[PDB]
C-alpha cells in the first residue's frame, strides 16, 4: 500500500471533524468538541491503488510552535474547508494557504478547497466565487455535506490524486 498524509484545515465550526469522522467511521456527528485534534488512519482503494490514509483533523487554538510546525509540515496535502453559509470562513482561506506555504517552504503544495454544509438551504458563499478562487490557486474545489455524505469521499480522494500529481 501507498501512504498519504492529509491535513484537514479551516476555521472553527466549518465541519473539519464531521468530515473526518464521516470518511473514517461512516457516520455523522451532531457535535464534536472543537478542542480535540486527533490523527486517524484508514485503508481504502483509490483508482485501483490500495492506499493508507493518515488524516490529521486540526483543532484547538490559533497557536504556533516549532513542534506544531513539524506536525503540519508532515502533511503532504491539505483540505482547506470553509462553510457555504459562513462568509468569514471563506475569507479566512487565504490565511490557511499562506501558513501551509510557510511550513512547507514551497509555493506548490497539494490542496483542495472544500465548501462544506452544502445540504443547507441558506448559502452566503456562491459556488462561483469559490470556483474562481480555486482556479486562481490552480486547485480543485469540491462541495460537500458531512451530514448527507455528499462529496465526502470525492474531497479526500481528489486530494490524494493531487498528491499523486506532485509525484
Amino acid at each position: 500500500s501507498t501512504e498519504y498524509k492529509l491535513v484537514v484545515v479551516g476555521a472553527c465550526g466549518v465541519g473539519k471533524s464531521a468530515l473526518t469522522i464521516q470518511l473514517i467511521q461512516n457516520h455523522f456527528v451532531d457535535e464534536y468538541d472543537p478542542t480535540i485534534e486527533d490523527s486517524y488512519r484508514k485503508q481504502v482503494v483509490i483508482d485501483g491503488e490500495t492506499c493508507l490514509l493518515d488524516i490529521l483533523d486540526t483543532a484547538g487554538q490559533e497557536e504556533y510552535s516549532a513542534m506544531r510546525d513539524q506536525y503540519m509540515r508532515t502533511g503532504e496535502g491539505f483540505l482547506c474547508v470553509f462553510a457555504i453559509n459562513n462568509t468569514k470562513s471563506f475569507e479566512d482561506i487565504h490565511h490557511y494557504r499562506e501558513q501551509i506555504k510557510r511550513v512547507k517552504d514551497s509555493e506548490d503544495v497539494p490542496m483542495v478547497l472544500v465548501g462544506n454544509k452544502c445540504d443547507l438551504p441558506s448559502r452566503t458563499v456562491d459556488t462561483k466565487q469559490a470556483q474562481d478562487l480555486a482556479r486562481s490557486y490552480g486547485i480543485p474545489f469540491i462541495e460537500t455535506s458531512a451530514k448527507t455524505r455528499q462529496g465526502v469521499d470525492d474531497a479526500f480522494y481528489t486530494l490524494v490524486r493531487e498528491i499523486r500529481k506532485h509525484k
Partner: antibody
Amino acid sequence: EVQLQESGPGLVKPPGTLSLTCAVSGGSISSSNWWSWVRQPPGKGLEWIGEIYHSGSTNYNPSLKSRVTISVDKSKNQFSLKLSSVTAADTAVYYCARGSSSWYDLGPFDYWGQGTLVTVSS
Amino acid sequence: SVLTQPPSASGTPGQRVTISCSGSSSNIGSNYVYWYQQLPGTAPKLLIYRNNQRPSGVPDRFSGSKSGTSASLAISGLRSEDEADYYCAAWDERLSGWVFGGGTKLTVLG
C-alpha cells in the same frame, strides 16, 4: 490535549484479579495511536505492561503475557487492564498512556495519566 | 530493567552532566531511544524523542545522542528544577515490546 485517568480498586486480594480502567477525554480512542499500561513499584523503575490499538491488536510484555489482558471500549472512550494471578510483587503505581502516533512519532508514551496505586496483598 | 543506566548522577548548578543508557543490538542498536523525566511525585514526561529531538517546552540545554548499542542524555546549565529521575526507553525486537532503563536519580547539589 488528550487526558487520561486511571480508576479501579486500590486493594486487590489474590485469587482476585487486578482490574483497571482508563477514561480518555480530549481525544478519541479511535485515533491512530497506541494505548499502553505502564507500572512503577514504589521507589523502583518503570515497566511496560502492554499496548492496544483501537482495532483490537495488542502487544504485551513477554514477562507478563500469560497474565495480561488489555481491551478497548470504543463506546465509553476507554481502555482497560486485567492482570490475573497477582502477588504482592504486583504492587505498583499503574499508569495508562497514549503514544506511537501514526502521524508524527514522539515515542510510546506521549501522554500519561496521573497513575493509581494498587496494593496487592492476600 | 532490560536497558542499563547508572543508578544516580549529580552535578552543581551551572555545570554539565551526562546520563548513559546501554542496551543491545535488539533494542538500542536497532531502534530509536526516547527519554522520560519524572519529577518527584509526578508522572514521567517525554524529554527527548528519536535519539536527539526535543518536544515543546524542553530547552536546548537537554540533548540526546545514540551511538551503537548505547545512548546518552546530556544536561548542561544544570538547574535545581532538573533534579528528577531520568529513564531511557526503546523497542526491543527480540521481545517485541517496549523496554526501559532502570532509572537514574539526578541530584542537583545543594
